[PDB]
Enzyme design. Structure first.
Site, PDB file in Angstrom:
ATOM      1  CG  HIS A  19      -9.044   7.725   2.219  1.00 49.31           C
ATOM      2  ND1 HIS A  19      -9.927   8.360   3.059  1.00 49.31           N
ATOM      3  CD2 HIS A  19      -8.234   7.055   2.923  1.00 49.31           C
ATOM      4  CE1 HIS A  19      -9.683   7.686   4.370  1.00 49.31           C
ATOM      5  NE2 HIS A  19      -8.600   6.818   4.281  1.00 49.31           N
ATOM      6  CB  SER A  54      -6.620   3.408   4.667  1.00 45.72           C
ATOM      7  OG  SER A  54      -6.441   4.685   5.422  1.00 45.72           O
TER       8      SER A  54
END
Lengths: 4, 179
Positions: B161, B110
């Site tokens: 992230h 991610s």
């Protein structure tokens, strides 16, 4: 753990 | 919209997740995770292989969905080498910041995904002729997603992230000057  | 790099990354993730199921998390973790020990620091695969590990089927599906959607677009419109580079830079950097945020036990694609989101959004913004773009329904959900990790709605890699997001914006911005 940690999720990326 | 199926390039070689798009599918090779998907296969890798699936290959690694299967192995995690045969052997268990810890066992793969001890081999692929970012070095926990400076003695292991020359185990150069570790700086990238953390991206392959997923800890839940939903997670490998969600991530590979985003990866195939946004990764396919970059590879189709911009080439395979462009996708290779976004992948390697952002896996490396989001892993780096994630380690500082909370140490070496983390994984998943991610960070790479948030760097694809930054990229496709700013690139289609500053550079429409590239033929990629991110919808505002999607950066609605990207923006909701970073912040949900913030507040602990769920155990997210938050350095990851934010580090990737930055990577993606930075590279898209460079690329939208040489365009």
């Amino acid at each position: 753990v940690r999720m990326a | 919209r199926a390039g070689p790099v798009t599918w090779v990354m998907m296969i890798a993730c699936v290959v690694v997740f299967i192995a995690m199921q045969i052997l268990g998390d810890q066992e793969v973790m001890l081999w692929l995770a970012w070095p926990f020990d400076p003695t292991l620091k020359f185990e150069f695969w570790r700086y990238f292989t953390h991206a392959l590990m997923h800890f839940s089927l939903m997670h490998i599906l969600f991530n590979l969905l985003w990866w195939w959607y946004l990764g396919g677009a970059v590879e189709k419109r911009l080439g395979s080498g462009k996708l290779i580079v976004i992948t390697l830079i952002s896996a490396l950097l989001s892993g780096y910041v994630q380690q500082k945020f909370s140490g070496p036990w983390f994984g998943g694609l991610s960070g790479v995904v948030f760097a694809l989101m930054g990229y496709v959004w700013l690139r289609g913004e500053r550079d429409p002729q590239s033929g990629i773009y991110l919808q505002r329904g999607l950066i609605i959900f990207a923006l909701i997603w970073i912040v949900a990790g913030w507040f602990d709605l769920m155990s997210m890699a938050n350095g990851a992230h934010i580090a990737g997001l930055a990577v993606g914006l930075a590279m898209a911005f460079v690329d939208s000057l040489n365009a």
